[PDB]
């Protein structure tokens with residue numbers, strides 16, 4: 001066992017490296033990324049005054065220094081949520097065709113907007129009024145949206161953030177460098193894991209540029225008896241189960257930077273990556289791993305960690321006399 | 330009115346410009362030298378929300394570098410020394426404040442060497458250290474920053490590193506400093522009338538030196554006027570001068586609403602008018618209040634531009650965050 005050329009050839013049939021840099025989005029030549037929109041989006045992403053309490057920004061739950069996530073079990077950040085979910089990483093989110101953790105199959109079907117806009121309530125008006133009250137924001141929106149008479153809209157808020165989101169990509173992980181042609185980029189163990197990941201059927205669901213993130217499956221995590229009275233490391237506390245009549249579905253989690261984004265699953269109840277791998281060894285989904293395979297895939301998944309964005313923290317617009325006051329709650 | 334040379338000369342006897350860059354801290358002689366390794370580790374810690382039991386709150390949360398070094402909210406509770414919720418003061422130029430707390434009884438204030446980060450600091454220290462030790466990138470950074478120490482991951486060192494980072498959170502070259510340094514056109518006529526009124530109406534009794542405050546305490550604080558505008562609050566003497574408040578440092582005041590220890594005033598103009606009162610020996614005309622308000626905007630310096638640190642990755646034995 002262990003031919004690099006064979007392994008690379010096989011991995012190239014199913015995965016793709018993350019690009020070094022994005023130049024446009026929404027190619028279906030798409031929409032040019034521009035410095036002005038990117039910078040406004042960054043400002044918006046870090047501004048806690050876009051929340052009612054004035055403490056919560058996108059950066060709070062999708063923290064760029066912590067793998068694009070908050071490292072906590074669950075939160076509620078978007079109107080489309082039925083309940084609390086683990087925050088997915090913003091890193092590489094631009095590549096995910098499937099935009100939600102879970103839903104009724106037939107409802108996710110005819111659903112266009114992502115989490116930022118889905119459904120979106122009072123918020124848009126409240127966001128715009130907050131933006132309008134600060135002249136530095138108004139000036140920024142006019143520069144980012146030069147062809148727009150009326151540029152401070154919730155759609156434009158969402159558009160500027162999406163442009164910033166497109167810069168939050170993590171090229172040059174060990175796996176990507178292996179893929180490009182560097183044999184020494186991965187260990188023997190990590191290569192054994194790549195091989196096992198591909199042969200045991202994980203790729204049915206975790207494939208393409210993001211190793212997941214593209215489609216939904218009638219399978220999701222549940223607690224076994226006493227899960228909440230058992231050691232947070234303890235094996236066999238949770239397992240995956242097929243939903244009844246396949247009617248409810250979960251997105252196959254995009255596994256890029258997975259080593260950075262514990263805890264795991266839609267409920268954020270698993271803290272060890274090895275345990276998440278063992279849980280995805282299941283007769284029900286059609287994957288079974290030996291102890292060895294589980295160990296090697298775990299080591300493999302560490303190679304999906306890319307170069308983290310280096311981001312200057314923005315200086316936020318000063319509030320003015322009629323900026324809406326934050327709510328205590 | 331407005332002999333520039335004379336006004337500048339007057340300002341220099343009572344205020345100082347913010348230095349371009351700090352080189353050492355704790356000069357009591359050559360102080361402690363600032364180093365790259367310590368500043369860097371201090372920045373990581375400052376942004377790391379895993380330093381709180383909830384895993385959500387970092388120093389950055391309440392002292393937000395993109396928001397003038399503050400959270401912009403009326404009050405919070407961040408340090409075991411607080412008697413009650415207080416408006417979070419700015420991190421910007423805090424290094425220069427000899428007075429360390431919003432308020433307290435004169436005596437408890439008198440006996441005390443440790444600032445907010447360390448005062449009264451419980452089980453926190455062990456929890457913090459355990460958390461840092463569980464991540465090898467932290468242990469490496471601590472070894473690099475404190476090379477002379479066999480046991481470098483301590484709560485003392487956590488605070489010492491953050492203190493070095495804090496020393497880079499300074500804001501030189503405000504319009505007032507540029508005027509002080511010789512640029513007559515750095516401030517408008519109104520702003521200069523404001524400087525002049527600030528100096529002659531007695532504000533400098535308490536708001537003086539490099540930070541326009543931050544240096545001592547006074548038996549005077551903000552209280553609400555009953556009712557459930559403009560006459561909503563007033564400054565008042567404490568019950569007998571045993572209870573005192575720190576003269577707020579006015580650097581970057583334009584950026585750090587809301588105002589006063591309770592964070593109940595939103596408009597700078599109103600905070601100025603509040604500080605006009607015979608109680609403290611100040612009295613402003615309508616025109617002086619307005620000129621002083623414009624002037625206080627010349628205290629807004631160059632905001633630090635900081636690369637957001639990439640945090641150490643947690644491991645199997647990193648303590649889990651608390652539901653809260």
Ligand code: HEC
Pocket residue numbers: 045056057058059060061062074075076077078080081084085086087088089090093094096098099100101102114115116161
């Ligand atoms: C916590 C209180 C959050 C706030 C603040 C923000 N987000 Fe979020 N985000 C959060 C959760 C719990 C989820 C999962 C929702 C679900 O049930 O599917 C999300 C999801 C996203 C995504 C999708 C990522 C993907 O993999 O495709 C994106 C792009 C996203 N969120 C962006 C985002 C923006 C731009 C925010 C500021 C306006 C924001 N989030 C805040 C939790 C929280």
Ligand code: HEC
Pocket residue numbers: 197200201202203204205206217219220221250251252253254255258261263264265266267276277280281285286287289297
């Ligand atoms: C389709 C039937 C799947 C196959 C085959 C595999 N996975 Fe999977 N994975 C799938 C879903 C629907 C989910 C989310 C489930 C939930 O309840 O949250 C996942 C999730 C993971 C994770 C967690 C990643 C995260 O960010 O939380 C990991 C580490 C993972 N899956 C690994 C993995 C392995 C190694 C597989 C082959 C053995 C595998 N998955 C197969 C869908 C499907």
Ligand code: HEC
Pocket residue numbers: 375386387388389390391392404405406407408410411412414415416417418419420423426428429430431432444445446491
């Ligand atoms: C909100 C939950 C906060 C957290 C998180 C942090 N701080 Fe804080 N800080 C907060 C308040 C309400 C106050 C005033 C305390 C008082 O009543 O006097 C402070 C004060 C400071 C200061 C004093 C600054 C000055 O103007 O001289 C400093 C230097 C400071 N705090 C530092 C600091 C550090 C390093 C933090 C992370 C360890 C941190 N604060 C968190 C509110 C909150």
Ligand code: HEC
Pocket residue numbers: 527530531532533534535536547549550551552574575576577578579582585587588589590591600601604605609611612613621
């Ligand atoms: C000594 C008795 C003082 C004199 C004279 C002046 N100020 Fe003051 N100031 C003082 C204290 C003790 C405080 C905080 C009190 C509290 O309850 O919080 C302040 C605060 C301010 C502020 C608010 C700044 C903030 O960051 O919250 C401003 C804008 C201010 N002071 C301005 C000001 C002016 C214009 C003065 C001359 C007319 C003046 N102060 C005098 C103490 C004292």
Ligand SMILES: [Ca+2]
Pocket residue numbers: 069086087088261262263264265268
């Ligand atoms: Ca996660």
Ligand SMILES: [Ca+2]
Pocket residue numbers: 399416417418585586587588589592
């Ligand atoms: Ca304030």
